[PDB]
Design a protein around this ligand. Structure first.
Ligand SMILES: CCCCCCCCCCCO[C@@H]1O[C@H](CO)[C@@H](O[C@H]2O[C@H](CO)[C@@H](O)[C@H](O)[C@H]2O)[C@H](O)[C@H]1O
Ligand SMILES: CCCCCCCCCCCO[C@@H]1O[C@H](CO)[C@@H](O[C@H]2O[C@H](CO)[C@@H](O)[C@H](O)[C@H]2O)[C@H](O)[C@H]1O
Ligand SMILES: CCCCCCCCCCCO[C@@H]1O[C@H](CO)[C@@H](O[C@H]2O[C@H](CO)[C@@H](O)[C@H](O)[C@H]2O)[C@H](O)[C@H]1O
Ligand SMILES: CCCCCCCCCCCO[C@@H]1O[C@H](CO)[C@@H](O[C@H]2O[C@H](CO)[C@@H](O)[C@H](O)[C@H]2O)[C@H](O)[C@H]1O
Ligand SMILES: CCCCCCCCCCCO[C@@H]1O[C@H](CO)[C@@H](O[C@H]2O[C@H](CO)[C@@H](O)[C@H](O)[C@H]2O)[C@H](O)[C@H]1O
Ligand SMILES: CCCCCCCCCCCO[C@@H]1O[C@H](CO)[C@@H](O[C@H]2O[C@H](CO)[C@@H](O)[C@H](O)[C@H]2O)[C@H](O)[C@H]1O
Ligand SMILES: [Mg+2]
Ligand SMILES: [Mg+2]
Ligand SMILES: [Mg+2]
Ligand SMILES: [Mg+2]
Ligand SMILES: [Mg+2]
Ligand SMILES: [Mg+2]
Ligand SMILES: [Mg+2]
Ligand SMILES: [Mg+2]
Ligand SMILES: [Mg+2]
Ligand SMILES: [Mg+2]
Ligand SMILES: [Mg+2]
Ligand SMILES: [Mg+2]
Ligand SMILES: [Mg+2]
Ligand SMILES: [Mg+2]
Ligand SMILES: [Mg+2]
Ligand SMILES: [Mg+2]
Ligand SMILES: [Mg+2]
Ligand SMILES: [Mg+2]
Ligand SMILES: [Mg+2]
Ligand SMILES: [Mg+2]
Ligand SMILES: [Mg+2]
Ligand SMILES: [Mg+2]
Ligand SMILES: [Mg+2]
Ligand SMILES: [Mg+2]
Ligand SMILES: [Mg+2]
Ligand SMILES: [Mg+2]
Ligand SMILES: [Mg+2]
Ligand SMILES: [Mg+2]
Ligand SMILES: [Mg+2]
Ligand SMILES: [Mg+2]
Ligand SMILES: [Mg+2]
Ligand SMILES: [Mg+2]
Lengths: 315, 314, 317, 314, 314
């Protein structure tokens, strides 16, 4: 009874719908945004409470591993894209030979796994058993984080040449937005890291020594993802610090103007000030040359200061 | 301010202090006791009222002591109380006896109480005193965990308030979140090394399984330290970004000043020369004059305001 | 320099090059394929028996470093530095199945060039007794060397930007610094992934490596580590440089503000004076005085000299 | 300025020069021993004078050294001497001889002495020269631990004068704590690595219970290092907020200057035009002309004063 | 200068040339040989003149070189020479020989040649050549740790010129220190990884004990890298501070401008209204008029000086 519920198992590589846990050497059941009909049917089939199952579907829930008698619950976060809304998701229940991924959102890695089983359905063999299937699901989810990270890098790219042109509100709002997403993703990477730490550290009925080691690889990958995310955080911050350090420079050229105007008419306005004084005997007031004389001395002053300001270089 | 009890030789019975025992293992909770009751405790257990007074020192540091005839474990738990959050407790263990005495209220502990009790009855316990120790510690860990989720939510909430520019309240809120966070880190660190102990050192009070459990709890505490640290980084981030987004303002201001000042500069000089006291002022007696110069100035102005509208000021 | 699509390697006595057409009579072969057209790829895939798509993975230059089982071959993606007009970059990938080690890359790999040309000196001589894992080692090491060289040169250019930095903030040079920075963040991502590949190669028991091989891949790991650390330090130094120029730009606002403030204080009072003495009342004290103008003019200069003194002394001018 | 001895069979006496054989272990303590005290000492114990002279060098950096016939363990201890906190001491052990020799007063050592002098308790050492080493180091490590609380207090006092605006005192206080903590870094990280040597390698001087001890002491020292670092971080952010806050006030200042300047601009122009002469100054001769123009000016000032109140700004 | 031979049989006989048998291990430190002398040595010891030119390149990088009938170790050692420091020093060890050659002064190998020749050094080696490698590398490491303190004295000096704001000499100096510190860092990293080789892999030239001694060395060298980074950031902090102080003084300036601009604004508007050409100026023809207005302006002024006095700008 599809929801979508996709099913995989055994010797050859058959798909299938609800029935017969045996023979079936291993069975991957995937359940997507199921309506309570599906939810309850699936539950009644696999011997897991509809509420237990619902833990998987609560989508803000934190990545972790848990033992419950007769099944293991792993919660891992997976990236979604949705027009600069980029955030996380899913749960996994393994009991006996059953690995169940049940997710309220779309998991692209699950999709990809499905397409990599889509090559010659009767092909692509597995001797490795459940822990390894868990490994792949997890690995793919990781790869996604990788691709997203590349996207961020492209984003950085764009903003990069808009950098040394000083402040722009649009630019910096884009920068800060990047910072935020970056931190969401970081917190999720952390959470996931630690799931992997457990899986690779503990002995568990579900995983072999080969599995366990595989998860360790997966852990070094995941740590790289962390290291980059943190790196690009520092980068962005720096970008902001540069823009602000440019603004603070225009804060310079500007006062250079203001001081140039103020300083270039100072002596002249003193002049006018004195030659507007109500004294009798303003030397040269009754001089017929006086007005033009003064006009001259002023203009010469101004010219001087404009030279002195020319070099040393200001104007 | 009351003691509590659990678990005799079949299943878990309850309560009375001063009862004949023979019990499997017995949990006794104690809260801000009064010197009388405290003494009563001292007698019933066999530890000194002096050794029991340590666990009561609220700033006392997390650690493990090995002394004869009891084990001491000091551990820091979160403390909520209305916008002001902090840290507390201590534990004593001998034989079948586990003793939690705090001078503040440990919500986790209370949770474990309600959880175990769930009247009546439930939750069979086969694993021993190391395991009770565990659950006490696991619930106390999970408290920090949920409070941290709170600080995360409360942290996002200062996001779009911040965008408004420097705000003294917004600030002090941040600064406080930081205070709480540094605090949380210190304690968290300590508790971590304690766990490093119960997972490492082989003891009489812990089994292999117990040890594994303490190890899980170790990795979890580590995770809380990681989280806490991140949050502090993000706080400092907000702080710096607003604080610094002030300087742009301090810029456009100088834009205004420099524009006013430069726009009327010439018109002022003009008006200055034409205020001069010479017998001859060109145009002075010309009845169109005042309007000719008036226009000179008006056009000078317009020209400057034009130089500024474009390229680019305003 | 020059570069060919396909190349080829050693067999039961020593190493010749080859026909495109040979198979089971050679000890181990190294095929190096560069930027194949789909048709050419189809020829290759046809001969070596690795699938088209499987190979095109190798051909995607954005592909991340890793090691893949995929029974009937091992795959290793490893990051190499790119020059391609002074924008330093990263790429490549590698398949080993049977005695065949295929390096295939969409980009140009300097290291593969180096190895290729070095094999010109097999006369005087050289001898390879060590089998595939060791070849792998040699390619991976050669790439590593490439990074190291890029790094040395960079350390050399830093000290050049170092003095330009002291002439005052320059948008060009800031550009260069920012660019080296970007390059080092690229190197970080890449060197990091590369390293963790090395860690697997030296750790996991693999049919294609042997305790000796792994032994090599270890010192390779450590080497990679040292690259990482050195590069981080180059970045830290770059960031230093930027931060210091800009921080030393933002001071000038001081001499500036001091100038504007100093003109403005030096004539403030004398202006007031000339202002009150321009108010036209009936009686203006000293105004009917023949010497009055010189009196006031003098008061004003003195006020000036004073403020100039309070300025010149006590810092400023 | 002194030497201090210890520990016969069954219990610990205090000994004049000299007695050796029977005693299980012996702890000599030389504080700033004078040249004659060092010759007496050196010949007395059997370790070279110039070799005792290194323990007297306070600059000497922590380590574990194996010489022929004895061991040198140099350690860092917090020293005080008037609100400038710092680091010091060395150690030599051969056979049953532990020797703590120091130029600077070492509080933790003084502490061991003044504690041992009680002797009401058992109080018996079964654990040997190794355990003695542990106890001494462990005490030093405690000293650090306590000074860290000192800092928690002082910091939580500075958090208050933080937003109060840049103060030079607040400044050099912060920068003083800073220096100190950098000190605790160098030292503490070196001390840490000694505990790592002592905890790992098999030494004739240390039993296994001994080593285990030194390990827990490793971890404790890791917390000291970590916390010290965090505190540095905090002081740093404090310098950052005050400084970056004092920065922001140039905004309110340029607001004032700009506002004033802009508020009388148009008016000073008016008075400028109306002071030009210029016969036929429009309105010059209307008796109500004056109040006319002055009305105009006042209104204008009002309209800017308003414009500011309205937008931002005031 | 040039060759120094060592350890003939049992005790330490600073030696003569030729011979080279009936020993355990021989150590020869060449100093800045002139081509003829490095020639003599070269043809004596049987290391190709070029193989030695190796150890003579002060700019060459450290590494652990397996040759046949030879082992090369390059290592970076500090130098003082008037506040300008650098790197150095190849080391060539074949069979039982260990050669240490350098173009610059090695105060470490000097401390070694000086510690071995005091009477009898004396001690002993049952430990083989490896342990001498260790003592050498080690000694050098101690040398570094010792310069670290010099930088410490320079920082100590700077700290009180810090709060006075910018000084060109101070600044350029901090910077200089900083970059020196960076050169140091790069070297320390080099050496380190060399030590990771000796500590890491079995070489027939090192025992397990040796290997482990090299590990201790590694850890110490890590503390050096850690000190290096720590103090670099300290320097950066120093700069950033003094700059922030500057950016604060700017405010006292701007406040001064604003206080002057505001002291006379109203009074200049007043002088502006009374300099108008209106035929009626209220109060002009009044003979107390002048001093009326004047006292008005004056009172305005004082009013503003006070209005600045508190809240105080003045
Ligand atoms: C796992 C460690 C690292 C992974 C996570 C890194 C965080 C950044 C996300 C990656 C790339 O960035 C993501 O890409 C999409 C488009 O593909 C962007 O979409 C859009 O976002 C905003 C909103 O309109 C626009 O400013 C932007 O120009 C546009 O491209 C978006 O800004 C961002 O959400
Ligand atoms: C454009 C519409 C209406 C215009 C009105 C009529 C004409 C314009 C105003 C007249 C100005 O009159 C002006 O005064 C004096 C002459 O007395 C001249 O002065 C000039 O000659 C003397 C030499 O003796 C010089 O010292 C002086 O620097 C120079 O400017 C000037 O060239 C003239 O231009
Ligand atoms: C523009 C601002 C000036 C005032 C506007 C009011 C309109 O009034 C109109 O302009 C002026 C104002 O005095 C009058 O004439 C007056 O100004 C004009 C110029 O602007 C002069 O040419 C003239 O010599 C003068 O008497 C004119 O006779 C009247 O028709
Ligand atoms: C920016 C201000 C420029 C104002 C100065 C203009 C130049 C004046 C020259 C005109 C004719 O010559 C001028 O005659 C008078 C005589 O009373 C001189 O005055 C001189 O002597 C008398 C002595 O009682 C003084 O009051 C005065 O300070 C002095 O300058 C003046 O120095 C000289 O220069
Ligand atoms: C503030 C900056 C610019 C202003 C400066 C120039 C002043 C002139 C402009 C005033 C408007 O226009 C001009 O002024 C006055 C109006 O009061 C008119 O003159 C009138 O003034 C008043 C009326 O209020 C009457 O007493 C008087 O009999 C009448 O002639 C004049 O006919 C007109 O042409
Ligand atoms: C510094 C700012 C301005 C200074 C003001 C000082 C006040 C002086 C007090 C003495 C009274 O002075 C008197 O006041 C009034 C003001 O309404 C003036 O104006 C009054 O008379 C005129 C002329 O007939 C009328 O047009 C006008 O409606 C009336 O108000 C008057 O010309 C002046 O003679
Ligand atoms: Mg259940
Ligand atoms: Mg189970
Ligand atoms: Mg089961
Ligand atoms: Mg099961
Ligand atoms: Mg199961
Ligand atoms: Mg795949
Ligand atoms: Mg594996
Ligand atoms: Mg006038
Ligand atoms: Mg102005
Ligand atoms: Mg002005
Ligand atoms: Mg493939
Ligand atoms: Mg891999
Ligand atoms: Mg693998
Ligand atoms: Mg397979
Ligand atoms: Mg390098
Ligand atoms: Mg970049
Ligand atoms: Mg890349
Ligand atoms: Mg070998
Ligand atoms: Mg080797
Ligand atoms: Mg600055
Ligand atoms: Mg020994
Ligand atoms: Mg001994
Ligand atoms: Mg300092
Ligand atoms: Mg030779
Ligand atoms: Mg040789
Ligand atoms: Mg060589
Ligand atoms: Mg040879
Ligand atoms: Mg020895
Ligand atoms: Mg010092
Ligand atoms: Mg010096
Ligand atoms: Mg060590
Ligand atoms: Mg007049």
């Amino acid at each position: 009874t599809v929801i979508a519920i996709a099913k995989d198992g055994s010797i050859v590589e058959p798909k299938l719908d609800e029935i017969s846990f045996e023979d079936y050497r291993l069975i991957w059941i995937d359940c997507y945004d199921p309506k309570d009909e599906e939810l309850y049917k699936l539950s009644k089939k696999i011997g897991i409470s509809v509420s237990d199952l619902q833990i998987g579907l609560d989508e803000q829930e934190i990545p972790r591993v848990e033992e419950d008698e007769d099944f293991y619950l792993i919660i891992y976060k997976a990236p979604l894209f949705e027009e600069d809304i980029t955030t996380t998701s899913l749960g996994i229940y393994i009991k006996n030979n059953l690995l169940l991924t049940i997710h309220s959102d779309k998991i692209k890695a699950i999709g990809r796994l499905h397409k990599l089983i889509s090559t010659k359905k009767p092909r692509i063999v597995f001797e490795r058993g459940i822990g390894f299937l868990l490994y792949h699901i997890l690995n793919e989810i990781t790869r996604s984080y990788s691709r997203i990270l590349m996207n961020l890098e492209d984003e950085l790219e764009e903003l990069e040449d808009k950098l040394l042109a000083g402040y722009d509100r649009e630019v910096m709002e884009k920068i800060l937005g990047l910072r935020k997403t970056l931190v969401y993703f970081h917190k999720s990477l952390i959470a996931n890291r630690d799931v992997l730490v457990l899986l690779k550290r503990k002995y568990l009925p579900i995983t072999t020594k080969e599995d366990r080691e595989n998860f360790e690889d997966l852990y070094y990958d995941t740590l790289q993802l962390i290291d980059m995310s943190a790196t690009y955080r520092e980068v962005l911050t720096s970008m902001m610090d540069i823009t602000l350090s440019l603004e603070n420079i225009k804060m310079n050229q500007i006062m250079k103007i203001l001081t140039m105007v103020t300083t270039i008419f100072a002596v002249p306005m003193w002049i006018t000030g004195i030659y507007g004084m109500n004294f009798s005997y303003l030397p040269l007031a009754n001089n017929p040359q006086g007005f033009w004389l003064v006009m001259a001395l002023m203009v010469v002053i101004i010219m001087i200061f404009v030279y002195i300001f020319r070099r040393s270089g200001w104007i």
